[PDB]
Amino acid sequence: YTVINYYKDAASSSSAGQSFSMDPSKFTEPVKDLMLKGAPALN
Amino acid sequence: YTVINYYKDAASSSSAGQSFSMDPSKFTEPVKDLMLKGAPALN
Amino acid sequence: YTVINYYKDAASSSSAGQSFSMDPSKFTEPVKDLMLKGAPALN
Amino acid sequence: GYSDRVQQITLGNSTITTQEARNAIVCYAEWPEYLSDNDASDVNKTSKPDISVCRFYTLDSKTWKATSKGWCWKLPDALKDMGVFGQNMFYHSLGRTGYTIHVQCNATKFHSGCLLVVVIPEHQLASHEGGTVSVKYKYTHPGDRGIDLDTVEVAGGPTSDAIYNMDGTLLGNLLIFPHQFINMRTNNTATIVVPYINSVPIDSMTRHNNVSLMVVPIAPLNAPTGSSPTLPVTVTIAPMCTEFTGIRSRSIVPQ
Amino acid sequence: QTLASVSSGPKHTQSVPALTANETGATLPTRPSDNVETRTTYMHFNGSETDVESFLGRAACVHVTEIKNKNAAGLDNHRKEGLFNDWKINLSSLVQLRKKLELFTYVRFDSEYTILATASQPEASSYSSNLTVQAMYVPPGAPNPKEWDDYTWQSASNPSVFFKVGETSRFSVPFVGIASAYNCFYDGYSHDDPDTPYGITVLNHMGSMAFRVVNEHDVHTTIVKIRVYHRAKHVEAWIPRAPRALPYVSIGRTNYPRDSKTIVKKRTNIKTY
Amino acid sequence: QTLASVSSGPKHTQSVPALTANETGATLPTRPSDNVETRTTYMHFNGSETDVESFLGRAACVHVTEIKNKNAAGLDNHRKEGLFNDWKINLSSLVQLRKKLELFTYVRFDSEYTILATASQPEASSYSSNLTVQAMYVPPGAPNPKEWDDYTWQSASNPSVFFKVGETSRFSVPFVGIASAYNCFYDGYSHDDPDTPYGITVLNHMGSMAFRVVNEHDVHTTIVKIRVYHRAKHVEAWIPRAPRALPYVSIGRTNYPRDSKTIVKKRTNIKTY
Amino acid sequence: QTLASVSSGPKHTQSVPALTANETGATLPTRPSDNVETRTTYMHFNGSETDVESFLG
Amino acid sequence: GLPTTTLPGSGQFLTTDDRQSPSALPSYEPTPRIHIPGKVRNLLEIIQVGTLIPMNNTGTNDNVTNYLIPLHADRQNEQIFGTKLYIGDGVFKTTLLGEIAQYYTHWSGSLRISLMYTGPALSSAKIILAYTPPGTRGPEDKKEAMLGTHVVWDIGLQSTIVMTIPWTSGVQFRYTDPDTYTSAGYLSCWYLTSLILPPQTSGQVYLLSFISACPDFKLRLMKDTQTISQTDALTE
Amino acid sequence: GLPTTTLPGSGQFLTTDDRQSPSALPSYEPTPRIHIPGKVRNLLEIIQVGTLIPMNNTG
Amino acid sequence: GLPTTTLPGSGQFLTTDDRQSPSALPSYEPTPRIHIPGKVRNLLEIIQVGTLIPMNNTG
Numbered sequence A, B, C: 001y002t003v004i005n006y007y008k009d010a011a012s013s014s015s016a017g018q019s020f021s022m023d024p025s026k027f028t029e030p031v032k033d034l035m036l037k038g039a040p041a042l043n
Numbered sequence D: 001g002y003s004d005r006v007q008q009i010t011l012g013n014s015t016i017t018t019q020e021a022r023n024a025i026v027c028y029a030e031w032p033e034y035l036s037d038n039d040a041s042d043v044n045k046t047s048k049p050d051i052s053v054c055r056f057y058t059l060d061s062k063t064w065k066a067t068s069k070g071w072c073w074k075l076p077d078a079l080k081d082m083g084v085f086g087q088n089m090f091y092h093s094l095g096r097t098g099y100t101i102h103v104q105c106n107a108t109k110f111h112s113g114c115l116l117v118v119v120i121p122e123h124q125l126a127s128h129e130g131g132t133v134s135v136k137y138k139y140t141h142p143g144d145r146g147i148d149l150d151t152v153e154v155a156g157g158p159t160s161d162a163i164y165n166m167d168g169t170l171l172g173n174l175l176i177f178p179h180q181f182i183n184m185r186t187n188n189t190a191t192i193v194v195p196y197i198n199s200v201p202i203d204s205m206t207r208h209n210n211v212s213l214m215v216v217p218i219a220p221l222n223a224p225t226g227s228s229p230t231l232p233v234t235v236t237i238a239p240m241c242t243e244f245t246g247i248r249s250r251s252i253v254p255q
Numbered sequence E, F: 001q002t003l004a005s006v007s008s009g010p011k012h013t014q015s016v017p018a019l020t021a022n023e024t025g026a027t028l029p030t031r032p033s034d035n036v037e038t039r040t041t042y043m044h045f046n047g048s049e050t051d052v053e054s055f056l057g058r059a060a061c062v063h064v065t066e067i068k069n070k071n072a073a074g075l076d077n078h079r080k081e082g083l084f085n086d087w088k089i090n091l092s093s094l095v096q097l098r099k100k101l102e103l104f105t106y107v108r109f110d111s112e113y114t115i116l117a118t119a120s121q122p123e124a125s126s127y128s129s130n131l132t133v134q135a136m137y138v139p140p141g142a143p144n145p146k147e148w149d150d151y152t153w154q155s156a157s158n159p160s161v162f163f164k165v166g167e168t169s170r171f172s173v174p175f176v177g178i179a180s181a182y183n184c185f186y187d188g189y190s191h192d193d194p195d196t197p198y199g200i201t202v203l204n205h206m207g208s209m210a211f212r213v214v215n216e217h218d219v220h221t222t223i224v225k226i227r228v229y230h231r232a233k234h235v236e237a238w239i240p241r242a243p244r245a246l247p248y249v250s251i252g253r254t255n256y257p258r259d260s261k262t263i264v265k266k267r268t269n270i271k272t273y
Numbered sequence G: 001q002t003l004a005s006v007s008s009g010p011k012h013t014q015s016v017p018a019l020t021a022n023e024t025g026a027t028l029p030t031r032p033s034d035n036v037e038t039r040t041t042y043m044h045f046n047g048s049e050t051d052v053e054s055f056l057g
Numbered sequence H: 001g002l003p004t005t006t007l008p009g010s011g012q013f014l015t016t017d018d019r020q021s022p023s024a025l026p027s028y029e030p031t032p033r034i035h036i037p038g039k040v041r042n043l044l045e046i047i048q049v050g051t052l053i054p055m056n057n058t059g060t061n062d063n064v065t066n067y068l069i070p071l072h073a074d075r076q077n078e079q080i081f082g083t084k085l086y087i088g089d090g091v092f093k094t095t096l097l098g099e100i101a102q103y104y105t106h107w108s109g110s111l112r113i114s115l116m117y118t119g120p121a122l123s124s125a126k127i128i129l130a131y132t133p134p135g136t137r138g139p140e141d142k143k144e145a146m147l148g149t150h151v152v153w154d155i156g157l158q159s160t161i162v163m164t165i166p167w168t169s170g171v172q173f174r175y176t177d178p179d180t181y182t183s184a185g186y187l188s189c190w191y192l193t194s195l196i197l198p199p200q201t202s203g204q205v206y207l208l209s210f211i212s213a214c215p216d217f218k219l220r221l222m223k224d225t226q227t228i229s230q231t232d233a234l235t236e
Numbered sequence I, J: 001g002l003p004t005t006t007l008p009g010s011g012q013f014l015t016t017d018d019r020q021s022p023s024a025l026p027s028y029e030p031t032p033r034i035h036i037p038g039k040v041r042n043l044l045e046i047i048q049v050g051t052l053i054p055m056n057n058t059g
Ligand SMILES: [Ca+2]
Pocket: E126, E127, F126, F127
């Protein structure tokens, strides 16, 4: 599909695409020492 | 004739073309053993 | 972004771009003899 | 031979040790760092006192009773009287910092109880009154004492609702913020490294708290038979990568 | 093709993924194949509709106001009479969108404003008037309208749109924050004073919008209602927080009703299905 | 050029295509040249208009409803008073299209909705009001409107369209089935219960649409009638069935009138022409 | 990137930019680094909205 | 003067369209972006984080005790808790997962349930967590329960047990709003042995349960929630 | 600001036209297609199947 | 007869937009520009010039 911007300002443009750079880790594993699934959580 | 899609979503597009892959056989001759027109239907 | 003029007359066109040739000097240092910041204003 | 449980943190002239840790959280997977030129606005040179402010300061102890609701500290407020850090905090117009928060609670293999130790960026508190009433400055600026959640509410102060996180949200969802638990059967401590999080490069350290450390008993403290029904809770905090600017005369604040 | 699940058989290992330590504050990505024998299957899915651009990318009503068109002769307070009205642009007055925005702490985006103006003539009138509304963007510091036909409506430097009642107006606005992002929350004050407000910051200022009917007056009164919709474009959001549980009570305040005590649904027995 | 018929002459063979065995369940493609001397002719035809895309590719009316615009003051049931209405999207209420869809068992497609809203003022009114209708897409689980001006109409996440009476609204909707196709028929139940309904499945759910006039009230009442048309795009259909013979009586049920006994036209003599 | 301010340290010079002579009718472009120790920062700005085309546009 | 024809829908305002519009502030320069930790790109990123389930739904008012599952010593064969798997309702409605799931119409994927033990270190126990797929009634006893997806938990150093609820379904998507055809089954807990407390210890011990989605998860058809409303517009 | 001229028929709703329209559910992902025997592409496919004629129209 | 769809905002007059319009005086020739000292391009050019502050606000 095609799109050309009709306006000078960047704000005028439509929606930005899909980020495709998801990374739940910053929220799900913000641990200092790496923990590996399957190994003792605490040794 | 020409057509360019003005929208991002596939649903937005107009009608799909003609299938050109008709095959009445699945409905007219779903027989296991092949029957040939002209030969005894049952032997 | 794109723009093509739909009219014959130059007046019909939209806004001119940013000048990028600013020069406050004609207003801030219209002195005959050059003065250098840091050296005696008057000797 | 080394363990995830025994750890040492040396910051300046202070060293902390724990033999019963449960790893540690580095908020949003980001370690503190100083302000960069690309991000800087303010043209002034920043002061970096280093080892004189970036050391561990220990707050006044708390007492975990079996009826305890929780406690809340606001940073940088809680460290405003802490040695050279507090000084610098009131001579400069702007400052910036991250911290290493170390919460301590030791017990007995016979005790049971569980604390939730969480760091909340921008913890805008709800008022006792509700409506359009705001929480008075002095109530969000308790200093070292912090906010003791099982204290009677006053006019213009925050609510004392742990269940509602003092902000209209539910306790169970507090896990979306960098947190750690202190489960006696397991834990002894909780350590959280906090980077600078803000919408501006640098800010005023007195009119704005960037975070509030919250320690909330979830599982009631249950001591063994004949044991003392309480346990103290100690909070040790170290500023890291501290920067100051806009030096002048001493900032004047209410009280 | 991305795999949703892989083929996985029986186990008898020393590697126990079913056991962990939530004390650490982490949530390890276990998959059903860690505790069950599985088959290979495909995601057949990218997750487009959950992108924050998507989530905040649709128009939502953020304000409803009203204005009128009468005979302003003898009227001493045009604002009270309803000849013009204001709106201190804020996105926390209507709750549907407010709960969505607040899922995050700092939020940066461009705005796409769509303004609808519908008319009504509640009492005896010969016909329905075709009116024109003016919507003026009044930045803080610009002079405020006082009468429905002030010099202020000249609007030489303030952006303004003229549109017809029954029609709609649409324009985009760049991220107009003085900081790098908008603050959904702000645990601070304007200055260290004992009595200044808390939370509300100019750090969330988006402006004030002024409205009026440009036409003079007919024999009847016409009531114009304005609905403002906001759509966020080119979105950026940081630091997710806990959803709002309690009802909202005020703009820009986390305050909640004190008699609201049962947000969680109750049973009788923890054992019932 | 494709051949419709080939040149074919006399026969006297042992190969008898005129004889077969329908017991087998097959229908062999015999051609007139199997039983008649023929001439060569050309199809001069592709069969475009019979493609299922064609067959279901035109808009058909699938619902007609009504709403009003009065003074809602003192009215306790806005829905009954007709200030707003619902529609549980279904394609089997109007029979013209229903018989077409049902020619197949499973059907998959995108929808192109066109909404027409016309107005009428059956009793003494000075003028004809220019109204604006809001059409809200209410997915199952979203809060239902209760009053004509609820918080629900804020529609922060639900798609909605605003259009004028006399005008039309048009939008497309992706195939929103939870399965791979829509069920024209379903010989099953929601769960194995002795009293739960039969046939009707969430497997055919397309949603519910809410309607209202956005304007306030005039002195007269205005009656707005809404007609919803559906057009199928990007069609896929499986398993053809027998056409419907008997009248329909209920939505989503194959039930037919019990006093309907003569669908086939009758003669007197099997020998008459 | 254009520089809004450069890194600048202590001074003890004979070059005194803090002193001038407004009698001349000129306004010399002094910068904060002429009277204060500064850090490097970027303009992150072009000045579009102040162009006369903008101003009267 | 290019000949055109306007189509049905011309002039409509569909809140869900995405087009260009003129900028009301032409030539304006937005503040530069500064680095800010904790960037969220997709909602599927945050529902992977486990949050507490208020499983002790018993009571009248919300209270921290709703998150605490009671455990009793020297009880054998007994049931600890039970619940339906309606993530848009019941005990899961207030959780972060259920909270975000309610902004969407369909859901699909595997679920993660962790149970964290808080009792003394010197205690012991063996518990059984079970998932009963749709098609029957909730188990009435451990025998019935163990016939389905289950995990036997041995309480020890490793404080938490994690059980995944594998996508067990015919149809590929279920509705978040409780609907019979699209139900997900039941979830229950029982003692495999029993809780044993050491000398000088007594009372109840509690379990903390967490819910989060696996990477398996999907949510579609965005809509408005039932978890927030209002009778009047708010003011300052 | 491209000069145009609208033609007769502008604004009409012809149930038989075929054009693009905006999707009310942008970014939405339809369920994957699974294989299903008995796909019908054209109606000419099924009328080639013989069905019984009610020739004993009497009654 | 190119099919189109008009969008929200159609017909609005936003004082701040920038588009082409027909010239009411087609074929007209403007006077030639002559050199004039003191050209101002940006307002940031002139605020760099110092002006007196009425600091003795008293009176
Ligand atoms: Ca009339």
